[PDB]
Amino acid sequence: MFYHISLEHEILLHPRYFGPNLLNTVKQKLFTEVEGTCTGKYGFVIAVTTIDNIGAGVIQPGRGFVLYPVKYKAIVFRPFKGEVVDAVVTQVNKVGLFTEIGPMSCFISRHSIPSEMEFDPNSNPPCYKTMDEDIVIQQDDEIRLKIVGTRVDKNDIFAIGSLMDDYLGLV
């Protein structure tokens, strides 16, 4: 889920970057360091909104670097299991359906699908209709889901969706 927290980072700065646009360079090196990453603590971090303050830079004894403990205010996206979200349907396959929740994608097997939404590989579009062909659920549909299990894969989140609850379809 999209949240708004104030995060901190300490960055090292090579002495060639001293001089007049120092703090501007700290900004640059923060924008292109903690953007679009993900963690098993805070999760996927979308972008940084503002920079609260730059600490005072403590010159490292021995080496020329000076590190700058900066606190920033960014929007982070952390799904929890059991949250009920909307997503768009990306790929319809007999092994399972693929959706995409913003920066993180999920997958729904026919085990999570009750038997109403049957396969449709005879049609050019693989969809999951029912027996009388009224509820057509194909690719590129805003289909809700419920995250039933989370998984982070080396700075990459991968949850798992389901279709067991009612009112999980077209709005």
Binding site: G19, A56, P61
Partner: protein, 78 residues
């Protein structure tokens, strides 16, 4: 209310000069005109005389406090 001595002790001068000369040798933009020398300790010493070293000194006090003093604030001794 800074209460420490207003003079740069002789240990701060050694460490400020060594540190500033390391930063200069790692290509940091000098604060003073070079009349044509190239050693980083001679440059750091020239900058110290011009009181243009961009470093502040955080003097911890024994109770846990501390005071920051710019280098251009305190009186250089030698």
């Amino acid at each position: 209310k800074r209460i420490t001595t207003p003079y740069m002790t002789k240990y701060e001068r050694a460490r400020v000069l060594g540190t500033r000369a390391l930063q200069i040798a790692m290509c940091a933009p000098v604060m003073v005109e070079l009349e044509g020398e190239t050693d980083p300790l001679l440059i750091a010493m020239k900058e110290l005389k011009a009181r243009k070293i961009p470093i502040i000194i955080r003097r911890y006090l024994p109770d846990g406090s501390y005071e920051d003093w710019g280098v251009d604030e305190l009186i250089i001794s030698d």
